[PDB]
A paper describes a structure:
Under these genetic constraints, cattle have developed a unique mechanism to accomplish antibody diversity by forming the broadest distribution of CDRH3 lengths and the most frequent occurrence of cysteine residues in CDRH3 loops.
These four knobs could be described as two-layered structures with the three antiparallel segments as the first layer, and the additional structural elements packed against the first layer as the second layer. The superimposition of knobs on these Fabs within an individual asymmetric unit indicates that there are only small structural variations in knobs, suggesting that the knobs are structurally stable.
Author numbering:
A (entry chain B): 2 to 9, 11 to 217
B (entry chain A): 27 to 265, 272 to 299
Amino acid sequence: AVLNQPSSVSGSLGQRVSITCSGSSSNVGNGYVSWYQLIPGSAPRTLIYGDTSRASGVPDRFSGSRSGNTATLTISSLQAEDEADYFCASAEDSSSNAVFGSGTTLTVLGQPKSPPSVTLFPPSTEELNGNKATLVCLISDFYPGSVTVVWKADGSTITRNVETTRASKQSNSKYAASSYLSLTSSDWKSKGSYSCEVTHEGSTVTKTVKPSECS
Amino acid sequence: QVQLRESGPSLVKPSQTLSLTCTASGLSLSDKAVGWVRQAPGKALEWLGSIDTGGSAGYNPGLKSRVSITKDNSKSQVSLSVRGVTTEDSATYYCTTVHQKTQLTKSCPDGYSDCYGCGAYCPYGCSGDDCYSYSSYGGYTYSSYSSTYIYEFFVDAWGQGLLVTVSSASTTAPKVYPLSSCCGDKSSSTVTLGCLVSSYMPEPVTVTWNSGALKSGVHTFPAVLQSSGLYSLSSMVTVQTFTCNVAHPASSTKVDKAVEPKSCDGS
């Protein structure tokens, strides 16, 4: 029912990687296998059909092959934008009964480190009219994709009512995230300054807003 | 060329019937069936079925009892129905064009080589048949092609997809608040503005700026989920008027919010 792929695979920038798709005589052994690329937040893209034929607009760096009940997708001269989930697919018994592979997440190693860009937004005058204040920390352009977020007011660390997203893939194959500090209107005005401190690969980037000077 | 677009409700109650529609158009539609593929949050791609030019529908055997696929050529639309849905049916649903064809394929029988690719070693009897074999026992034997069927399948084109959530919970439309930097912020020639899409459920929402006319310098962030069960996300612009267009399909709400930098005027 499933075509077995490795859950995850890694390769170096500028080198080659291979993803396998193993099945039985009914599917992969049938000799017509397709491959698809899925970049999160994007429509799937067909890469290969009929074992070795490349779909339109797919460069020769992508290559398909098959030996018995196991097909492999081979990507050469790996680039950052090749980071995606790759699925094999095949027909089984019928040409209108498709089986998909379990999927493989590809990581391209060896890309440069990138510090995060941080923007801290204060609560709006409209929101504070409802006695609530949402501080918004927007974090973009960091690789690798992992940051730790810390909120502070007047030097003290705040843990209450903090909610932070996981890092998500941007359009440029880098990562983005956000953190939200939820306060009452009185909490917002009662402190001299709030800070959003974003730590990435041991380095911290900080932005700060002052309520009394926010107008 | 192909254009595939999915439409239908983003939220469906358990045990009800999920109904979706795909509006297809383009010269590249011909020779192709229109199919439906879904992907649940942590799962792989799953095939649902398709309807071909001949007007017949084929289905995933595991879902045939619950799935129905029809077409309305007067509207150039193909429909999908899933009966008795559970939370297992929450997924992103893709409209596709599909290639499906059973092909008769000729190959040499076991142990025989092709008489066309023997170079200068071809036996003379190759003139009468397609394949040949040799054993030091009985010498050269000959044979015709064997015939097998090869079932071809591949998805050609994909739609953008539509997210459907199966749940019995109601919706909450978002509030849109403007985002602008503090007046006491250290300044630069770059202005950061944004829109806070706050406290909605369920997913998704979309954000554009100035009805799509403004795109460069626009960064929209995936949502956070609070303890209340409500989502919130923000979209920011870096650089006139600035209007963010927020759409929340599950509640049938569209919001236009004009955003200005802080005047820092006493006003």
